[PDB]
Amino acid sequence: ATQRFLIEKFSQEQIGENIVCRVICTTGQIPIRDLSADISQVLKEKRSIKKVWTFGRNPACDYHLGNISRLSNKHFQILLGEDGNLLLNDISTNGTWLNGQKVEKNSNQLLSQGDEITVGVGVESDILSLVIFINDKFKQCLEQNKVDRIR
């Protein structure tokens, strides 16, 4: 009797097993991508950063943008580590914006829930906005599993 089994499929695949965060463009320019990092690697690393994403118009960049001259090859970068939270690192030639407020380039910032990054500032019609989606599931694993001292 697989009566219960049928219910298991109801919940479907649980998101947040490795997928750190997801970037979604609100202005409709760049295709939504999924950023992820392995938990084992994060827990194993007790120094420096674990995994960082590079975004821009470059096909190398962990994030492929549309084609904005105002933006650089790797306009912005996202780093995950420290303790468990997320960090946002701007790396554009023109600058990276957060909700209209320009942040310090190549600087680490505490990520925000459903936050948004604006880029290509200079001309009213040459600005592009992006949205960062973070899953609480990922945070649950980190909290449920503390580094060192196993219970």
Partner: peptide
């Protein structure tokens, strides 16, 4: 040579 720029960086520092 003569071509168009790639990344128009706003004059600033």
């Amino acid at each position: 040579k003569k071509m168009t720029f790639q990344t128009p960086t706003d004059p600033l520092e």
